[PDB]
Write a protein that binds this ligand. Structure first.
Ligand SMILES: O=c1c(O)c(-c2ccc(O)cc2)oc2cc(O)cc(O)c12
Length: 275
């Protein structure tokens, strides 16, 4: 599939850079014809087939295809796609309140504040999983706030760079995200499904409540080893006045066997969450 090959600068003016990762750089931008603001993500293309610099066209096309499907208040939306020899440029919805990661670093939350973020994440993931989309990279830095100067910030899930449509209950691709948040099936290179996202939600919940990362070791390999062995515990110093139902929620997500792990529907019916 090809994208718009006119110069993006003829239609948009760029401004503040919002951040960058290994292959993408994201800049605030404004569409000239409407004055409406967006986030332009510039994704570096592979220059040769055997290269490992840049993103393969197959991976870029998968991300765009998934993004085009989604319209939900808790997930980022895609406006337009441009490309040139060097980059594919995704014109995305602007979410300007910054990362949940940075929000947590400025402030530990209450269980109310924790559940208010978590419930939105769950609703967003419920939508994705209903469409058989596994995100595969759920973590606080991939959660963006619309406005962080409000008591109960609204959030949107971003970064669909590892996302896959799961048409057969599982996928068996490369797929490996951030060690602190990946499920044991990812660590062990086993077939992956929607269950992996639910493990990541358990990790996120643990962090939301405690300010600590449950499997984090001194090196990347230690963290991965901890994940595979389900080496975590609720430290009393962090959790002594956290409700037992909150711990039960996390406990039923941080389960090695994907089949025994809570699904997104289970998580919404869990007594800690259910109205
Ligand atoms: O740093 C990043 C970032 O800020 C954003 C972003 C911010 C606001 C939006 O409205 C949309 C995206 O996306 C990203 C996507 C990546 O793959 C890697 C990144 O580093 C970012």
């Amino acid at each position: 599939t090809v994208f718009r090959q006119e110069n993006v600068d003829d239609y948009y003016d760029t401004g503040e850079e919002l951040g960058s990762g290994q292959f993408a750089v994201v800049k605030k931008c404004r569409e000239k014809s409407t004055g409406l603001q967006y986030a332009a993500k510039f994704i570096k293309k592979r220059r040769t087939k055997s290269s490992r610099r840049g993103v393969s066209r197959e991976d870029i096309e998968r991300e765009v295809s998934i993004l085009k499907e989604i319209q939900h208040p808790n997930v980022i939306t895609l406006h337009e796609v441009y490309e040139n020899k060097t980059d594919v440029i995704l014109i995305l919805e602007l979410v300007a309140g910054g990362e949940l990661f940075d929000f947590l670093a400025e402030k530990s939350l209450t269980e109310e504040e924790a559940t208010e973020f978590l419930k939105q994440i769950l609703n967003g993931v419920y939508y994705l999983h209903s469409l058989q989309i596994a995100h595969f990279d759920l973590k606080p830095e991939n959660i963006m706030l619309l406005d962080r100067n409000v008591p109960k910030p609204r959030i949107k899930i971003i970064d669909f760079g590892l996302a896959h449509k799961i048409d057969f209950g599982n996928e068996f691709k490369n797929i490996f995200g951030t060690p602190e948040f990946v499920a044991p099936e990812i660590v062990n290179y086993e077939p992956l499904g929607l269950e992996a996202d639910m493990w990541s939600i358990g990790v996120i919940t643990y962090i939301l409540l405690s300010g600590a990362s449950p499997f984090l070791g001194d090196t990347k390999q230690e963290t991965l080893a901890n994940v595979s062995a389900v080496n975590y515990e609720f430290e009393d110093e962090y959790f002594s006045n956290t409700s037992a139902l909150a711990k039960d929620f996390i406990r039923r997500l941080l389960v090695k066997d994907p089949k025994k792990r809570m699904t997104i529907q289970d998580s919404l019916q869990h007594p800690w969450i259910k109205p």
